[PDB]
Amino acid sequence: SDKKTLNDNRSHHDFTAGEKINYSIETVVPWNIANKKVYTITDNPSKGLIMDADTIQIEGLASNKYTVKKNADNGFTITIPAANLAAFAGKTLKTTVKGHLSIEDLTLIDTGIPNKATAKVDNEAHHEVKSEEVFTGGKKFVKVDGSNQSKTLAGAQFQLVIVKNGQVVKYAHGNEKDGYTFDTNNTNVATKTTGENGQFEFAGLKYSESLEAGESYAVKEVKAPTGYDLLKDPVLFTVTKDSYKTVQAADGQKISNTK
């Protein structure tokens, strides 16, 4: 029968925006394919997931035997002449392809995002199949006065970094839409600025348990609110399942500032 599988040998299917995700699609080819005209596979990713059609491979079928079209929903359509599938009659076609997350709607954070696909023979669709869901997480924060925590502070700027053994080891670049990358380079760093309610956030991040050994996410203050001391140390934080979506922004992790 048909199937779509997430190839991710973890118990948790969390990814950072931009990271590559491997999938496999299996689609039955009918016994009488030689009497048909066309076989198509249409990949319909759920919102948040972008497929990379340039990564498609079909097992036992050379790339010169089918065509691929990229579609507006960020999926694709593979079109295979039926004549090119005679050897596969009664067998299952195996397609592999990658995607990545790109979040343009923050309500998608901490929601399960499946890949979906549907095979069709001439005008007649098999049942749509879905993969396991992937997830991306996030964290919300509030900049406050340490001596009056109802006083939220505007104008703080915080960078997203990774710390290990109490040192900054990586700087983030990018965002939840364009994707994040992490490296040692301290320019064009992912940064947010607080408004009057002190809120800022970083979304599109895999869970903390998925980091490398010893690593933590942290936010590093690089500009203080007027009249307040710059923080000496990065502020560590933890991302888990639902740590973004189930926290209203005003309830985000408080960071105290001193006048």
Automatic annotation (TrEMBL):
UniProt-recorded name of the protein: LPXTG-motif cell wall anchor domain protein
Residues of the full protein shown: 208 to 466 of 507
Organism: Ligilactobacillus ruminis ATCC 25644
Keyword set, alphabetical order: Cell wall, Membrane, Peptidoglycan-anchor, Secreted, Signal, Transmembrane, Transmembrane helix
Domain of life, source organism: Bacteria
Lineage: Bacteria, Bacillati, Bacillota, Bacilli, Lactobacillales
